[PDB]
Design a protein around this nucleic acid. Sequence first.
RNA 1: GCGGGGUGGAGCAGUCUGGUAGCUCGUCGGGCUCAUAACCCGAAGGUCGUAGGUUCAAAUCCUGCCCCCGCAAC
RNA 2: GAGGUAUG
RNA 3: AUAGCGUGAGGAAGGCAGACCCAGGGAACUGAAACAUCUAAGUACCUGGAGGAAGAGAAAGAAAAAUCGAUUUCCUGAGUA
RNA 4: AAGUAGUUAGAGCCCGUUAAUGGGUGAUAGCGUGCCUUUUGUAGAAUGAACCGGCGAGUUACGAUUUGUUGCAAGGUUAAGCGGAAAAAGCGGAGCCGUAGCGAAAGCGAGUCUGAAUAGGGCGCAUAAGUAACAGGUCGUAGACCCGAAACCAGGUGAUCUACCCAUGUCCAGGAUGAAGGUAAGGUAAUACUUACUGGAGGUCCGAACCCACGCACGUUGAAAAGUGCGGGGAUGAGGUGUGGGUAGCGGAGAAAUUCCAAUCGAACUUGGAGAUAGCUGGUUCUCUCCGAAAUAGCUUUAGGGCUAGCCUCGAGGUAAAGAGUCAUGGAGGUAGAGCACUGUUUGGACUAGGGGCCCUUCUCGGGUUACCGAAUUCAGAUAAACUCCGAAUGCCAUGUACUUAUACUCGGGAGUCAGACUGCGAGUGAUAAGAUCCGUAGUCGAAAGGGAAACAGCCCAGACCACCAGUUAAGGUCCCCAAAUAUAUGUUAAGUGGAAAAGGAUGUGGGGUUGCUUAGACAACCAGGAUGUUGGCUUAGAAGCAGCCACCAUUGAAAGAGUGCGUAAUAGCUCACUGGUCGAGUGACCCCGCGCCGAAAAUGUACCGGGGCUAAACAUAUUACCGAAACUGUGGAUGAACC
RNA 5: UUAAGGAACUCGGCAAAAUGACCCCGUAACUUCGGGAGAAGGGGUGCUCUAUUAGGGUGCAAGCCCGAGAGAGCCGCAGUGAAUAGGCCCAGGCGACUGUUUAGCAAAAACACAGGUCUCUGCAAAACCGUAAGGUGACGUAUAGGGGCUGACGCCUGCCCGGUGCUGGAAGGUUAAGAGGAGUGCUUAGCUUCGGCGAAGGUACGAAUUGAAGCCCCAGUAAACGGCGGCCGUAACUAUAACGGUCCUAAGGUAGCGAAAUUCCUUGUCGGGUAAGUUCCGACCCGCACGAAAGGCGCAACGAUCUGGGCACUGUCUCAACGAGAGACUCGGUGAAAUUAUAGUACCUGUGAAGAUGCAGGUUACCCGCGACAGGACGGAAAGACCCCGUGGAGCUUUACUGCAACCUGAUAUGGAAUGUUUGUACCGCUUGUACAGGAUAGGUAGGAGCCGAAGAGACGUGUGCGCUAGCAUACGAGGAGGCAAUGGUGGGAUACUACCCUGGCUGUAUGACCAUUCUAACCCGCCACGCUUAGCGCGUGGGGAGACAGUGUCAGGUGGGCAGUUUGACUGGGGCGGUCGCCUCCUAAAGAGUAACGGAGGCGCCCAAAGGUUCCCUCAGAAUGGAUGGAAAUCAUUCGCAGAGUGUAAAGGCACAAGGGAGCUUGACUGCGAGACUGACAAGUCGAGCAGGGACGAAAGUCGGGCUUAGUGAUCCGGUGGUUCCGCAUGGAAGGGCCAUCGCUCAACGGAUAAAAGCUACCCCGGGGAUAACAGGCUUAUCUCCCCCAAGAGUCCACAUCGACGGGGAGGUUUGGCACCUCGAUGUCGGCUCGUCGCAUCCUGGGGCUGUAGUCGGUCCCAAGGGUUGGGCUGUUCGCCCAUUAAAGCGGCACGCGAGCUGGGUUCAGAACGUCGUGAGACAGUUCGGUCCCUAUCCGUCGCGGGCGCAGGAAAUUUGAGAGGAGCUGUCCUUAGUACGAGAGGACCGGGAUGGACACACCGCUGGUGUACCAGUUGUUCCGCCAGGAGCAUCGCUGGGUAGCUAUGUGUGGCAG
Length: 63
Amino acid sequence: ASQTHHEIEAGRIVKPGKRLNNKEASAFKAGKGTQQKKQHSTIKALEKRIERLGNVEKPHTTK
RNA sequence: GCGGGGUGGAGCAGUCUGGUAGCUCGUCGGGCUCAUAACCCGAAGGUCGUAGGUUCAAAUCCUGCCCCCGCAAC
RNA sequence: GAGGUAUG
RNA sequence: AUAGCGUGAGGAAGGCAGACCCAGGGAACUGAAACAUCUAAGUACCUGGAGGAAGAGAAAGAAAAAUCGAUUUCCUGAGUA
RNA sequence: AAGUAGUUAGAGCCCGUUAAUGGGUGAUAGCGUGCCUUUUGUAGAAUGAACCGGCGAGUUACGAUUUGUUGCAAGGUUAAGCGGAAAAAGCGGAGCCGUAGCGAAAGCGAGUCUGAAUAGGGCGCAUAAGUAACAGGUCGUAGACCCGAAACCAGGUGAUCUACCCAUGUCCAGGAUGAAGGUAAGGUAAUACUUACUGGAGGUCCGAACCCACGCACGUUGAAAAGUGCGGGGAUGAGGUGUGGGUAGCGGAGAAAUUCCAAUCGAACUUGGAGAUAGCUGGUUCUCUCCGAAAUAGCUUUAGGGCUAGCCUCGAGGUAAAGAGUCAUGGAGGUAGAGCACUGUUUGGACUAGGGGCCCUUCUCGGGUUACCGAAUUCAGAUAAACUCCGAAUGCCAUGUACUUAUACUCGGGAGUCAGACUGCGAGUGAUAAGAUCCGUAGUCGAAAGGGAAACAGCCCAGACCACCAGUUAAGGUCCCCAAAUAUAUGUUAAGUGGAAAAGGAUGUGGGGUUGCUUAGACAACCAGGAUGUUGGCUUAGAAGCAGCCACCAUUGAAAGAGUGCGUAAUAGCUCACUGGUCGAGUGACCCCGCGCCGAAAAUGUACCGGGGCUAAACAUAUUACCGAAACUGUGGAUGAACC
RNA sequence: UUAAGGAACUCGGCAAAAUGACCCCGUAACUUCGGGAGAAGGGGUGCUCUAUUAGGGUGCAAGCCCGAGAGAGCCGCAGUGAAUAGGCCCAGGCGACUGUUUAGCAAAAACACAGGUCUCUGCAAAACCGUAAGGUGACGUAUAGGGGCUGACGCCUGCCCGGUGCUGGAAGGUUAAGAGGAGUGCUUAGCUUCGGCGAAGGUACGAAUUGAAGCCCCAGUAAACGGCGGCCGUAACUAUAACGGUCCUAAGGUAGCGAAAUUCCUUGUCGGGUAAGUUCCGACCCGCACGAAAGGCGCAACGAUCUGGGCACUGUCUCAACGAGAGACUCGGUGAAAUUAUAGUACCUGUGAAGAUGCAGGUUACCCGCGACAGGACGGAAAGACCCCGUGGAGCUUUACUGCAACCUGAUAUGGAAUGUUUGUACCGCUUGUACAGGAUAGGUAGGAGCCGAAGAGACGUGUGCGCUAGCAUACGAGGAGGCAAUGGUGGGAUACUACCCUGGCUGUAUGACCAUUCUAACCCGCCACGCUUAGCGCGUGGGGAGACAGUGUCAGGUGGGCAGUUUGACUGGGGCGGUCGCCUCCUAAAGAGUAACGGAGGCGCCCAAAGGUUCCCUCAGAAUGGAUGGAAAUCAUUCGCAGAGUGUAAAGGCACAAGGGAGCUUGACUGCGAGACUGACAAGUCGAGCAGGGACGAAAGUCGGGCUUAGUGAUCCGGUGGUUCCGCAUGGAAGGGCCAUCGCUCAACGGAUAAAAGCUACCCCGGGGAUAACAGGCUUAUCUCCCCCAAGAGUCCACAUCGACGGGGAGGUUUGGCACCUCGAUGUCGGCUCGUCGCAUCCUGGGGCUGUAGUCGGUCCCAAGGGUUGGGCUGUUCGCCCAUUAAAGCGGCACGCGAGCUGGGUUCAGAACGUCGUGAGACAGUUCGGUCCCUAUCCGUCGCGGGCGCAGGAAAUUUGAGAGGAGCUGUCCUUAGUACGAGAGGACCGGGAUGGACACACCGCUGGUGUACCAGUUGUUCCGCCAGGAGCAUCGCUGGGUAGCUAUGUGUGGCAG
Ligand SMILES: [K+]
Ligand SMILES: [K+]
Ligand SMILES: [K+]
Ligand SMILES: [K+]
Ligand SMILES: [K+]
Ligand SMILES: [K+]
Ligand SMILES: [K+]
Ligand SMILES: [Mg+2]
Ligand SMILES: [Mg+2]
Ligand SMILES: [Mg+2]
Ligand SMILES: [Mg+2]
Ligand SMILES: [Mg+2]
Ligand SMILES: [Mg+2]
Ligand SMILES: [Mg+2]
Ligand SMILES: [Mg+2]
Ligand SMILES: [Mg+2]
Ligand SMILES: [Mg+2]
Ligand SMILES: [Mg+2]
Ligand SMILES: [Mg+2]
Ligand SMILES: [Mg+2]
Ligand SMILES: [Mg+2]
Ligand SMILES: [Mg+2]
Ligand SMILES: [Mg+2]
Ligand SMILES: [Mg+2]
Ligand SMILES: [Mg+2]
Ligand SMILES: [Mg+2]
Ligand SMILES: [Mg+2]
Ligand SMILES: [Mg+2]
Ligand SMILES: [Mg+2]
Ligand SMILES: [Mg+2]
Ligand SMILES: [Mg+2]
Ligand SMILES: [Mg+2]
Ligand SMILES: [Mg+2]
Ligand SMILES: [Mg+2]
Ligand SMILES: [Mg+2]
Ligand SMILES: [Mg+2]
Ligand SMILES: [Mg+2]
Ligand SMILES: [Mg+2]
Ligand SMILES: [Mg+2]
Ligand SMILES: [Mg+2]
Ligand SMILES: [Mg+2]
Ligand SMILES: [Mg+2]
Ligand SMILES: [Mg+2]
Ligand SMILES: [Mg+2]
Ligand SMILES: [Mg+2]
Ligand SMILES: [Mg+2]
Ligand SMILES: [Mg+2]
Ligand SMILES: [Mg+2]
Ligand SMILES: [Mg+2]
Ligand SMILES: [Mg+2]
Ligand SMILES: [Mg+2]
Ligand SMILES: [Mg+2]
Ligand SMILES: [Mg+2]
Ligand SMILES: [Mg+2]
Ligand SMILES: [Mg+2]
Ligand SMILES: [Mg+2]
Ligand SMILES: [Mg+2]
Ligand SMILES: [Mg+2]
Ligand SMILES: [Mg+2]
Ligand SMILES: [Mg+2]
Ligand SMILES: [Mg+2]
Ligand SMILES: [Mg+2]
Ligand SMILES: [Mg+2]
Ligand SMILES: [Mg+2]
Ligand SMILES: [Mg+2]
Ligand SMILES: [Mg+2]
Ligand SMILES: [Mg+2]
Ligand SMILES: [Mg+2]
Ligand SMILES: [Mg+2]
Ligand SMILES: [Mg+2]
Ligand SMILES: [Mg+2]
Ligand SMILES: [Mg+2]
Ligand SMILES: [Mg+2]
Ligand SMILES: [Mg+2]
Ligand SMILES: [Mg+2]
Ligand SMILES: [Mg+2]
Ligand SMILES: [Mg+2]
Ligand SMILES: [Mg+2]
Ligand SMILES: [Mg+2]
Ligand SMILES: [Mg+2]
Ligand SMILES: [Mg+2]
């Protein structure tokens, strides 16, 4: 869920607000790209933590 | 576009592990009652969204489509 | 005789 | 009685040559084209002891059908095992 | 009068030399965007340098390998050490290399290992030159080419700044407010309680000194490495300050900000390990001569690094001369194209299993069936990177004795390269865009000067050893800038097209090809008629030549359509078609070719031929001269390889 | 200092102005009853006389100081006359407060605070520093001390203990070192024949059993970490749901508050305030995503806090003017710096590493300077801090990896004496022995035919014990000899009795473990008395206390970000996400081979004991009919049929004289190898006739070293297994190794870094790069804007007045984008201010054509760039909405013009906080508060001023005018004429004239401003010796005026007519 949350954030990082101007928005494209990168890094860190949880197996319900 | 799901009327399982249709509420009928409810007695109602596949056989395994709830996009 | 100890 | 205290006879204390050696303690940078075993390295550095040298040293040894005869240093063995 | 500052031509002026086709200056004319670095590419609006001078970067030891030289040669050589002048011999043969290899080894031995093998094959021998020393090249270990990190570790120095604290001192003008408490009067049964007075509390108020630092301005190569001025907060308290002291970096102090620990703090300063390491950038100093790349493959914790190969150079080899080019001949191959013989996509037609409906019915069983669809089947015709019955050119493999020509291969030493750029051709991605990107192919640049494209890496022509006040030529050009034709002949163009841009529009202009009418009279104008039954016949407020629907004939006449449009309630009127008179020669319709026009507009200043300016100095066709390069030649010099 | 206005400025009332002192009157909501409060709002202040004053202080008195009201007057614009000395009010958020904080960008809503709460701690406290001693704590003692959280006060603080931590438990499971030492190998004295067997001892390795804490487990615990849900339906209907059902939960958010320091949509809606309000106040509640000690809600006082409004005040502004002084300027003296390749350093257009002082072509331009401005020199400074890269670094975090301290725990040594429980082991005794069938309570082996017994048998009676609840044994009373077996049957087995056993159970002994209690002599005492000794250290002596515990050492397990060292991929039309990474097949791939891309399509990580080998045999798909279930299509007959089938599996190639299908026999799915080729960097992969060995099939020829072919896989290193005429560190062995065969890799990031590895950085750093991004430029032009072709149609009709579908073509280079070509040894960003300039695709004015143009007004289109093209509210804002005007309120280019010209609100520097995501460090084109914009102008250029020379003599004046700049705008009213036109409503063209706005120029006579060497008034104090008159300083002291000069807001004129 947090991973979806950071995906939403990352997609928003690079779409400028209505309040902005073209020329003004164009100046922070790169820093917003790096914010986006940081979000993606958070995502990959979450995936690593999920791996570190393990492949816990559902218990066996004998038929 | 990404997730959940689609199984009698409602909500939920059952799927992963192919042969098994289930729990609660409800519905219909007959009793009790002056009558309704509650209670007691029985019964019905699902081909598991859909079209095709695999299999001896599919709710169940594979594929495409169509719908609903969320989240995004817009 | 007094005092007390489900619905219409 | 010992502790302690006092007296006397000796002795030490400290320094250096930013060198050489003996011990105690002991890194990391680096290299491995990361890195942790490993390396760098028992190096640098601290400290203690010294002496003109120190250390080692007179086989509980090295070796092999043949024996050699205390230690040390050099050449080789060898960049071999 | 601009001009990488000179150069080449060159007057005039002035001097007189290492005397030699001399010196200094230079009006003027032509040409001309520094050096270095890194780059596909730099005048570069990329980097570096103020200038001048000095210093400042491949070295030494030891080892490996190879080349050359010398000595001995199946042998060669000594190391330490004795000796001795910090010598030279002599001694020293221990050891090292080579002479025999093969095998994991035992072991066998010109053979050996594998293997059952006597087979074959691997490695060797056959097929015999090494060794010691010197020098050159390179490699390795060492800082190893020079400079350069941020950081790490170890030993110490620092709390005279600053944080916190310890003890001891000291400072806070003046004013204001008026807590608790207390006393007295009133009040009460007694308390409450009220009023006054007293009192002097407070992280209290106001406000200087003191401390701080909120705002603004100025300063900002400052008066000052944090201040100045004007205002501002606290100012008896969690106060300010002095003196002396403590806490020390794997740490301490923190009313806590990553704050402070001597102008240094996400871990001080100094010294040492230490020339850390740096696949990174920068730099790396004299000359000429010969040859001369690459920006690719593959692998890579790899992508701006490296390694091997491909490409360069040097040397030596070997010959059944193997290279390159063309000719001939023989072959693989399935592209372009073409085709439909399969597979897909598809158009039209024939025809239909089947589905939907109207239904007749009816246990909706089966029919009437519907063009409402319709699997398929079949006929003709289209289409294809991942379709092919077919199938080239080229390119490739080879053969040859053909005919030219100059390499190719092998071994060894030494590298550098692994960012590539445009252009043309073929394909992708892309948008059939990009100076985009990615392959293939060839070329140029890179690493290439020169002539032409105005200027211009990458286009066109073409390859600079040197000199020459010689010649012929290429591309491109010949009126002037600007060298050479105001060239020759025939035509086109009228826009400055040339010297920009589309669909599309257009009686532009020229040339062809057709076709109709026509001196028994065309076209064009002018004039006259243009009728009638019926107003065709319905509708409507209208339709009555000319809203719509259908019907679309007849009469006379030279002609007239049951009328081509404007218009009306429809009339009406304007008019058309058609007819005749007048006139007197070409006239109207199409298709193609060429050259032009409109479409067509942008931002400092004409500004889309380099400019002037050209109507030929443009375009097409053909031709003849000339200019024009560092090309080629001529003349003379220097030089490399091969052969003489 | 300023006319008039007065916040229109602006991010914002920044700054400035205004207030200001003493006395008096008077003073609100609210309030924690202290305050608010100097609230606010207003008045008076001078001098003289009454006045040695009423009255006070002092004093023996004389005298000397303080000076209360009042009247009566005097003068000024003004009487704290100067200087010094609060601006106030309303509303709101936050934090209660005073205080502290990032020395040198942040003063705050952050820290602290008192207060609350949890928690721990019995004193040699806990916690901390340190190796330890020793100390703080504390010279204290649970009303004390440490840590965590919250943050005055008021009302309150809800549910959840499933997880995670913390506490406690104590039965079991798992769990070490150590203890134990069953056994196994090797060795060999002998035994054996070779092979081999093998005692003792030594040696290598070692199983059982034992073995703590922790963990698993159970309770509890939330002011501990933390968490606080969905779906369907339901009211007489319109909506919604008080109500019901059901899943999941550990439990599903209580109060209170709420577009919030939190609300995206969102400038939400409504209301208020304003002409106009993205801000503000109050309410609403779809709370994207409040919420109860990460505290909730509220709140007086406080605040250099943030926010909104108002009164006053003002040069903030409309829109600037004057004055003073300091620089600047000239003279004299003295005398740097950053920088610098050399320089004789123009403009346009273009080209060019795509933005030229220096190139080209044109145009301008005499030489040398001075003062001023800053467009450019991609100017200077600072080897970009953004971005990317580097197998670079530091700091931080954690359930990344590996470790370390520290603690907990156990064994063992220091370190011994008893007693006792509970198990264990061995021995003596005594009881124990039931499947079934069978007389019935059969343990086994053997003997066994007789055996026991009056010195006490069977049987009877009683109790006790067992137990299969049948009965067995055991003792006790009487009694006194009799019983049972053999035999038979039952059965695996026989009964009597005898012995040796086994299985348990009990007593007794003897050994040997664990645990507990006690003792005391080791050790310890941060207890006392004494002594050394003037000593709160130490040591000794005597008591007292703990005591085999503690502590220390060695070993071992656990916990362990408290501390440490490190890791945390590459390609990539920037990086990142997504995807991919190795092998096979096609297309691309351009007819040999090869050939790239984040180019288009698919597959693989197997299977088959027949799906192989051979020998023999035959041949498919599909259609046409004929036919019973049976049909579109099962199976059958005939015909057609080069393959339209199948080929284990993707595709390509190939195959019907099989490589496709059956059957038989079999295992060549063999061992050794292999001339030679393919491919190829290497590693490797591929094909291979044939030789030998020994076989299978077939009569034989001959074929067969897997499958029609092409994928089906992974190095070494290290281990394991089997085998071997190999080695075996003195010899014999052995261990250990080699050699051959084989095994163990989603080492799939597949030529594999290590056995073993994730993250934050907004506190950051270094080396590099325009090889690589963000701004700007350049190329392109899908898009964007603009223009047009066609013309169905709309428009009573009528395509083309005005629009114009389906489709089509272009221009431009303002948008979104693509490319990555200059610049990373610095090319500064949005918005605004100053200044503008250019284009035209013209907004207004001007001219005109068409009109579905009556007139007025208008629509559309052509020519035109001369001039003009507003001021405010909200927001940082461009944009946009609104108010009000205008003739009109143009679109765009210039590094979306302009930061060596200014601002610096926003943003993305460090602080802090909200909500949210994260265990966390931390982060968010989510928000909020707060926050350092350096430079002395060399050259060109620009604006002005001079010097030099020339202009064929040297001078003085006046001048033509090439050429060049400037200006160029426009409304309203009257009239024409209420004429034309119109049914009316309405209402012109053209023309004539008057008066204005904005703008420019000039000037100061007027209105005003300024006027620091003019005049006056006046305060305090010093001086001129005193009075008087004057002077100095106090912003020129303040104040009232004001000359010249300068000047606008004032006046004159202008753009007329052409
Ligand atoms: K000695
Ligand atoms: K051989
Ligand atoms: K210092
Ligand atoms: K709300
Ligand atoms: K400038
Ligand atoms: K840059
Ligand atoms: K500028
Ligand atoms: Mg089923
Ligand atoms: Mg009732
Ligand atoms: Mg390393
Ligand atoms: Mg320049
Ligand atoms: Mg420089
Ligand atoms: Mg120099
Ligand atoms: Mg010190
Ligand atoms: Mg105070
Ligand atoms: Mg105060
Ligand atoms: Mg001050
Ligand atoms: Mg104060
Ligand atoms: Mg002081
Ligand atoms: Mg001090
Ligand atoms: Mg911080
Ligand atoms: Mg070192
Ligand atoms: Mg260095
Ligand atoms: Mg050459
Ligand atoms: Mg083709
Ligand atoms: Mg093809
Ligand atoms: Mg390119
Ligand atoms: Mg090419
Ligand atoms: Mg190069
Ligand atoms: Mg050239
Ligand atoms: Mg040229
Ligand atoms: Mg060049
Ligand atoms: Mg040449
Ligand atoms: Mg010639
Ligand atoms: Mg000429
Ligand atoms: Mg030549
Ligand atoms: Mg004023
Ligand atoms: Mg005034
Ligand atoms: Mg305003
Ligand atoms: Mg404004
Ligand atoms: Mg202010
Ligand atoms: Mg505060
Ligand atoms: Mg500060
Ligand atoms: Mg500050
Ligand atoms: Mg507290
Ligand atoms: Mg202690
Ligand atoms: Mg707090
Ligand atoms: Mg526990
Ligand atoms: Mg604001
Ligand atoms: Mg709570
Ligand atoms: Mg304060
Ligand atoms: Mg000056
Ligand atoms: Mg740099
Ligand atoms: Mg760490
Ligand atoms: Mg390291
Ligand atoms: Mg990368
Ligand atoms: Mg090919
Ligand atoms: Mg041995
Ligand atoms: Mg790889
Ligand atoms: Mg922050
Ligand atoms: Mg850097
Ligand atoms: Mg670039
Ligand atoms: Mg760009
Ligand atoms: Mg640029
Ligand atoms: Mg520079
Ligand atoms: Mg610069
Ligand atoms: Mg126009
Ligand atoms: Mg605002
Ligand atoms: Mg505004
Ligand atoms: Mg700009
Ligand atoms: Mg700006
Ligand atoms: Mg500049
Ligand atoms: Mg700001
Ligand atoms: Mg932010
Ligand atoms: Mg801000
Ligand atoms: Mg200046
Ligand atoms: Mg100057
Ligand atoms: Mg005047
Ligand atoms: Mg005076
Ligand atoms: Mg006087
Ligand atoms: Mg004075």
